[PDB]
Amino acid sequence: MVPDWEEVLGLWRAGRYYEVHEVLEPYWLKATGEERRLLQGVILLAAALHQRRLGRPGLRNLRKAEARLEGLPCPLMGLDWRSLLQEARRRLGA
C-alpha cells in the first residue's frame, strides 16, 4: 500500500494542507530510502503552506523538503513531485 495520489492531491487542491500531512504520516513511517524521502518531502511542503496560512514562516520547511527531494527520480511512487514542489515554491514566493 502506497498513497492514492489522486486523493492526496485532492486534499491539496482543497487547501487541506494539514490533512495531507496527517494522511501521509502512516506511509512515511513504513517507508524506506527514496520512498521515505519523497513522503517526508511532500509532508514538509504541505507543512510549509499550513504554517503560512497561520501567518508563520514556511521557508524552513521548504528548505528541509528540498533537501529530502534533491536527487530523487521523478516521478516517484506515481507522483510528479517536481510539479508539486514548483507549486509550493510559487505559493511561498520562493
TrEMBL record:
Gene3D superfamilies linked to this entry: TTHA0068-like (1.10.3450.10)
Protein's UniProt name: DUF309 domain-containing protein
Gene source species: Thermus thermophilus (strain ATCC 27634 / DSM 579 / HB8)
